[PDB]
Symmetry: C2
Subunit: 158 residues, 2 copies
């Protein structure tokens, strides 16, 4: 299926982050707050894999990084309104990603698109820290940010 | 030094391995697992997608996250069963479902059963549209990987 870029891929902390968008999808179970395939404008996806700095956390470099909490903020140029979109983990035909069906609430135009990526919640993931089997890295405390200041929403490309 | 619980199993879309080795220190320390000092060992359930596998959108060999894994231990000659809830974590060699464990009934031969449940309803999704989506669906009842003659003789380290 056709994917369109949001902007240039970013390397932030131990993460390589890509952003793409494409036609709205039908998800099962549907994230309850996300617009249906009919009501959405598009599906946005954050593709997140460990980079070389991720090795210190125990991830294989290039592997998908699960259990993260990803939120996107969309803000049309010249507007003070900011849309907050919670992404959810899911599999598509091409593997796991974090994503959401969305609506660009202020219509066609240029938007600032920001992904804020939080490490796993305290009780959802652990690291081995003993010298023998452990890792020397640790999860980031402040969310990591990947952003594009001039994304053009020019309507469906499908 | 890692030791197998038994031979790897292929159950549905999962390639499941079980190994044990010395206790580890985890941060945060999960649920009610014993500390590195209190534990007998660390047991890991290594779960990766097999060819069947691709039907859910995974790539062969990929770690399968968001699963809920529990182990049941029963010493031969005993009616008692100990439940071990595994937690997701990274070690220096990558992601695993693991747990520090203290064998309540001590030394002996055990029946070891891993029950693997698909992600919770609100924890994961599949694209199901024709265009972007997948044909497979998660399993309802937990998948089982079992070894009947696991020998616990004490630390091998
Ligand atoms: Cl913003
Ligand atoms: Cl937290
Ligand atoms: Cl910032
Ligand atoms: Cl049992």
């Amino acid at each position: 299926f056709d994917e369109f870029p949001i902007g240039e891929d970013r390397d932030v902390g131990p993460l390589h982050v890509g952003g793409v968008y494409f036609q709205p999808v039908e998800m099962h179970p549907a994230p309850g707050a996300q617009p249906s395939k009919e009501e959405a404008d598009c599906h946005i996806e954050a593709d997140i894999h460990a980079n070389e700095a991720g090795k210190d956390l125990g991830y294989g470099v290039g592997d998908f990084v699960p259990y993260l909490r990803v939120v996107a903020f969309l803000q049309k140029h010249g507007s003070e309104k900011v849309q907050k979109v919670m992404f959810a983990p899911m599999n598509a035909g091409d593997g796991p990603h974090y994503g959401a069906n969305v609506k660009f609430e202020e219509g066609l135009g240029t938007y600032k698109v920001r992904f804020e990526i939080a490490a796993p919640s305290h009780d959802e993931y652990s690291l081995h820290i003993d010298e023998q089997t452990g890792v020397s890295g640790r999860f980031w405390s402040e969310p990591l940010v990947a952003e594009w200041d001039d994304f053009e929403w020019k309507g469906p490309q499908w």
